[PDB]
Amino acid sequence: PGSMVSKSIVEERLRSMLSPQFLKVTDNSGGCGAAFNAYIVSQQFEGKGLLDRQRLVNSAIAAEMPQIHAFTMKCLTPGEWEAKNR
């Protein structure tokens, strides 16, 4: 009720910027507001360390971040995803 950040907006922002091969967003919204966990497989993470990956994801949802209580993520390249056997 009255929240403008949703799992759908998060999904759309991530898809728009990161064009993932695989995305699983968990809606973890609760007492303190909107919150999500994002499992993201994207070629956009190739050539980047984990902090630089996190930066890229946060930059996708920069406009929404002040309205997000918590956001957690796991960022893999499609190569790493295949090597951890998905």
Q: Which residues contact Mg ion (rule: CB under 5 A)?
A: 68
Q: What is the DSSP string of 3-71?
A: ----HHHHHHHHHHHH--SEEEEEE--BTTBEEEEEEEE-GGGTT--HHHHHHHHHHHTTTTGGGEEEE
| Smallest gap from residue 31 Cβ to Mg ion (A) | 13
Q: How far is the CB of 49 from Mg ion (least distance, A)?
A: 23
Which CB atom, from 68 or from 73, has the smaller least distance to Mg ion? 68
CB of 64 to Mg ion, least distance (A): 10
Task: Return the SS3 of 82.
Answer: helix
Task: Give the pairing type, strands 34-41 and 22-27.
Answer: antiparallel
Give whichever of 23 and 68 is closer to Mg ion, judged by the CB atom.
68
Report the binding-site residues: 68-69
Binding-site residues for Mg(2+), please? 68-69
Looking at the Cβ atoms of 45 and 71, the one nearer to Mg ion is 71
